[PDB]
Amino acid sequence: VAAERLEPRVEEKDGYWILKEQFRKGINPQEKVKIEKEPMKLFMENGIEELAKIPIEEIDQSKLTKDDIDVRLKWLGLFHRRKNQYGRFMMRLKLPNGVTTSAQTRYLASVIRKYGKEGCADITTRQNWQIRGVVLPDVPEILKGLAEVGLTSLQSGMDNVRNPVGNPLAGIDPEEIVDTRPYTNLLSQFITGNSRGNPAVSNLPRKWNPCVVGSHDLYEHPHINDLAYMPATKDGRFGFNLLVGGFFSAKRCDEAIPLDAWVPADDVVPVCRAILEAFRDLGFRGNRQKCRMMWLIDELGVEGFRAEVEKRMPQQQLERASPEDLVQKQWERRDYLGVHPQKQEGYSFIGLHIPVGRVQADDMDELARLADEYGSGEIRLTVEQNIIIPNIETSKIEALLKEPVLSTFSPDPPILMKGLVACTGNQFCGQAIIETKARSLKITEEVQRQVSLTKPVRMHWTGCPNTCAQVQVADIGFMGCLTRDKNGKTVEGADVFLGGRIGSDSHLGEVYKKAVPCDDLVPLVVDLLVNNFGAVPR
Numbered sequence: 276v277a278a279e280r281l282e283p284r285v286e287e288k289d290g291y292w293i294l295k296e297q298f299r300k301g302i303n304p305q306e307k308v309k310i311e312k313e314p315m316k317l318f319m320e321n322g323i324e325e326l327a328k329i330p331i332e333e334i335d336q337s338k339l340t341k342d343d344i345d346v347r348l349k350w351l352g353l354f355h356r357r358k359n360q361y362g363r364f365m366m367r368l369k370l371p372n373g374v375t376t377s378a379q380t381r382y383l384a385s386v387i388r389k390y391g392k393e394g395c396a397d398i399t400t401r402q403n404w405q406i407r408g409v410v411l412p413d414v415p416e417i418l419k420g421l422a423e424v425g426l427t428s429l430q431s432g433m434d435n436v437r438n439p440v441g442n443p444l445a446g447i448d449p450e451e452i453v454d455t456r457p458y459t460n461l462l463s464q465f466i467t468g469n470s471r472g473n474p475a476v477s478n479l480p481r482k483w484n485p486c487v488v489g490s491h492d493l494y495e496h497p498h499i500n501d502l503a504y505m506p507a508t509k510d511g512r513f514g515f516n517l518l519v520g521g522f523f524s525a526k527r528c529d530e531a532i533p534l535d536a537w538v539p540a541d542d543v544v545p546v547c548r549a550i551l552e553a554f555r556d557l558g559f560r561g562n563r564q565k566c567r568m569m570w571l572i573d574e575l576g577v578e579g580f581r582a583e584v585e586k587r588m589p590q591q592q593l594e595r596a597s598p599e600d601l602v603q604k605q606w607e608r609r610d611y612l613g614v615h616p617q618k619q620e621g622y623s624f625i626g627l628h629i630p631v632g633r634v635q636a637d638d639m640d641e642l643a644r645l646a647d648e649y650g651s652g653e654i655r656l657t658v659e660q661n662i663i664i665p666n667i668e669t670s671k672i673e674a675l676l677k678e679p680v681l682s683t684f685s686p687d688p689p690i691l692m693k694g695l696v697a698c699t700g701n702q703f704c705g706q707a708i709i710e711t712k713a714r715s716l717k718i719t720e721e722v723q724r725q726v727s728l729t730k731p732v733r734m735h736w737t738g739c740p741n742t743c744a745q746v747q748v749a750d751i752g753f754m755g756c757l758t759r760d761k762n763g764k765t766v767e768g769a770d771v772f773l774g775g776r777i778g779s780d781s782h783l784g785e786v787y788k789k790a791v792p793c794d795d796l797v798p799l800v801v802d803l804l805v806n807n808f809g810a811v812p813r
């Protein structure tokens with residue numbers, strides 16, 4: 276690869292990072308949006324204050340302001356639901372390691388409550404909160420309210436570093452490798468500039484997903500992250516081996532590969548910065564389907580990319596990977612739902628099933644109440660869109676199990692529900708081909724009525740090829756499509772995926788059967804479970 280290819284393509288100008296004039300040819304429309312006006316100015320220069328005052332019908336009359344609300348606002352975690360909930364915004368947080376408080380939960384509930392039938396909230400596949408129903412005029416007050424309770428929504432969408440995922444059992448599991456919270460906290464603080472905004476990492480060629488591993492279970496899905504920190508001792512020192520470039524897209528799904536790099540634990544932020552700077556400086560900015568970091572790694576080769584990371588490290592030092600990491604390959608992924616003892620004697624955590632991750636304001640208040648009465652006011656989110664309430668004095672468990680709300684958010688739902696994951700789908704998402712959340716619950720309920728089983732089969736439902744619900748990791752995955760019934764009528768369907776494995780022995784699933792009408796999935800799935808997963812007809 277020629278030396279000219281390694282010239283940084285962006286430069287700092289007045290606090291922000293912009294494409295250099297000579298690298299602007301052939302760029303995609305999103306890159307043009309970023310050049311036309313720096314999205315971070317909406318927050319960092321309080322551009323949102325005046326924008327929020329303009330009636331949305333007027334906003335839609337000019338490209339600049341329409342791009343503000345449809346594109347640039349995603350840098351403030353605000354997502355206009357133009358097609359399916361016009362004039363309303365989904366709002367997405369930074370929530371490193373999935374950790375929330377009862378006060379934060381009540382605040383979020385109070386926001387969605389205002390919007391009535393237009394409001395609700397969702398736990399995401401990055402153990403994060405999304406709230407719904409937000410109107411533009413309310414945005415300045417919501418931003419203030421979030422800050423007041425110690426939350427940020429910065430840089431959660433578009434060409435930004437996404438929610439830092441960690442071990443949902445961090446600090447509490449007797450079997451953890453290393454508490455991931457300090458590291459995911461540091462990453463989030465770095466990414467968001469301590470909630471003020473960090474323009475140095477907000478003009479990436481594309482989204483970028485990080486995780487820090489602290490579990491033998493690999494709850495963090497390191498194989499599908501742009502950067503995964505794998506805990507590893509090297510030459511008597513604790514640190515992390517680095518995996519890079521994992522991603523899913525409509526066009527291509529790839530597992531992360533070794534960078535062949537180990538960093539001491541204190542270098543977590545420095546190496547995150549170095550990798551992001553290399554991606555920012557050198558990444559392709561044409562066809563959006565070829566802008567994820569793995570495409571850069573393929574273009575330079577992993578060694579060429581590694582050299583770019585190395586030159587951006589303090590003292591330009593980057594050690595090679597440790598021959599072994601601390602993750603034990605002899606491991607069975609553990610169920611976290613139900614009551615489990617913590618490493619702190621006399622304390623338990625409880626995992627509660629949240630059906631397809633969907634909650635209303637009243638539900639959130641009740642969960643916050645439980646966390647206060649039984650725990651320490653902490654609620655943890657998981658990437659299967661469930662919750663854990665930690666730090667419960669074990670003597671309180673008997674009373675907790677009798678709480679009425681646990682009939683809805685159960686510590687021991689049927690096994691197929693335990694593993695069920697579903698994206699937003701067409702209730703709110705404009706890209707969705709099908710409805711996902713209600714359908715997946717209905718189908719799963721019918722399937723489980725017909726068969727019993729003991730294997731923890733994981734079913735993932737995603738509404739379009741963006742695969743936000745990660746169908747390629749599922750035992751049985753369902754990707755939304757339109758198909759045809761026996762009479763040739765248009766019906767909702769799914770492409771069915773098999774072969775996904777998680778944990779250390781990970782594998783990406785692939786399409787098994789295309790174009791199955793959703794109304795025909797129950798018998799197909801029942802038979803798959805009996806024939807391949809040991810299920811028994813009732």
Ligand code: SRM
Pocket residue numbers: 354365367397398399400401402403404405431432437438482484499521522523524525564567697698699703704705706741742743744745
């Ligand atoms: C909420 C969530 C799914 C869920 O129900 O949990 C979600 C929802 C959306 N995703 Fe995603 N993605 C979610 C995790 C993912 C993941 C899974 C992951 O991170 O492990 C992926 C696949 C992994 C990956 O990115 O490598 C994913 C791949 C995408 C893509 C395809 C990326 C690509 O390279 O092509 C898009 C479209 C895009 O970015 O161009 C997308 C775009 C979208 C948008 C923002 C599209 C839009 O604006 O409507 C969706 C918002 C719908 C809504 O109203 O909720 N989403 N999205 C997840 C939020 C995570 C978070 O808290 O930050």
Ligand code: SF4
Pocket residue numbers: 698699700701704705706707708737738739740741742743744
């Ligand atoms: S997979 Fe498609 S339908 Fe589901 S949330 Fe992502 S973009 Fe929307």
Ligand SMILES: [Cl-]
Pocket residue numbers: 349432433
């Ligand atoms: Cl986005």
Ligand SMILES: [Cl-]
Pocket residue numbers: 355356357358359704705706
């Ligand atoms: Cl839309």
Ligand SMILES: [K+]
Pocket residue numbers: 628629630631632659660661695696
């Ligand atoms: K769930």
